């Protein structure tokens, strides 16, 4: 696994290392801790909440990872009970949400992650992983 695996040079925009590697990162706020793999790492991800240019704002969701077969993208499954008033009871329902995961996190199917909303970074991705709990 190497950082420079694309046809273009991978780097953080406008972060200049004068030859005569400097890394930029930020905290996302809302009491979420920046993983040290972002402060000290070497991966380049324009969509990472901590090392990229995306911002976390909107809704914070939690869910169970059900797919890690995409590159830097996971799908989480959110389970909830839908109330049916006529029968005064509930029915189990689920929604699948696609979220971006930065290389600062390691997630497998079955983990519980916390994702924060960001700007649309794909056709179906609007959430970006902020926290991981092993399962």
């Amino acid at each position: 696994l190497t950082v420079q695996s694309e046809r273009a040079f991978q780097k953080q925009p406008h972060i200049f290392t004068n030859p005569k590697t400097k890394r930029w990162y930020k905290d996302v706020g809302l009491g979420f801790k920046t993983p040290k793999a972002a402060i000290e790492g070497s991966y380049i991800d324009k969509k990472c909440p901590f090392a990229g240019t995306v911002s976390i704002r909107g809704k914070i969701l939690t869910g169970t990872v059900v797919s890690t077969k995409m590159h830097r993208t996971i799908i989480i499954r959110r389970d909830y009970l839908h109330y049916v008033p006529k029968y005064n009871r509930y029915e189990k329902r689920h929604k699948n949400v696609a979220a971006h995961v930065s290389p600062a996190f390691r997630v497998e199917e079955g983990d519980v992650v916390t994702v924060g909303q960001c700007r649309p970074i794909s056709k179906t991705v609007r959430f970006n992983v902020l926290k991981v709990s092993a399962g």
């Binding site: 046809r7 780097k11 030859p19």
Partner: protein
């Protein structure tokens, strides 16, 4: 015409969506500039809000920056040598952003020699000023070697189809080593 709406796509589940409404003007697209190298030819585009964009159809020169030295100069663009998106842009010499180009090295060589005095009649004070600037005058080997050919490697930073400029910065460091490896292969 060209439309950027997402209605014509099928959903994430794969279902084809029915036609909701006629194409709206606030979701239009236009055609690529496909900037070439030749005597300057720029057409204005009237955009939303009455604003203006510039299609660079042809440009010769651009503003290129030597980041380490903190100097920017206007210099000719020789040709496109590498493009991470499509190799046909290299073959046809189409200037877009992130295109690797060769720029004329003379304005930077002239600044370097006038600023430091080395190569790649003065007063006593001028010679002392140059001596003060000495020691910082040693540049990277991979950059120095290019001056023999009189052409530096650069990457386009502006968007020529959006601003009409074909500007960039001079390749340096491991980015220069990266694209050198790409070019030699």
């Amino acid at each position: 015409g060209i439309s950027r709406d997402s209605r014509h796509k099928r959903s994430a589940t794969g279902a084809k969506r029915a036609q909701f409404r006629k194409k709206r003007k606030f979701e239009l697209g236009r055609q690529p500039a496909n900037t070439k190298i030749g005597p300057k030819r720029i057409h204005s585009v009237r955009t939303r809000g009455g604003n203006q964009k510039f299609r660079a159809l042809r440009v010769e020169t651009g503003n290129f920056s030597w980041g380490s030295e903190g100097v920017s100069r206007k210099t000719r663009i020789a040709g496109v040598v590498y493009h991470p998106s499509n190799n046909e842009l290299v073959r046809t010499n189409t200037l877009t952003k992130s295109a690797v180009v060769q720029i004329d090295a003379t304005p930077f060589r002239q600044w370097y020699e006038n600023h430091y005095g080395a190569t790649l009649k003065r007063s006593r004070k001028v010679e002392r000023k140059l001596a003060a600037r000495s020691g910082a005058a040693a540049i990277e080997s991979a950059v120095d070697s290019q001056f023999g050919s009189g052409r530096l490697y650069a990457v386009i930073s502006s968007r020529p189809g959006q601003s009409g400029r074909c500007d960039g910065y001079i390749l340096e460091g491991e980015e220069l080593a990266f694209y050198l490896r790409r070019l030699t292969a």
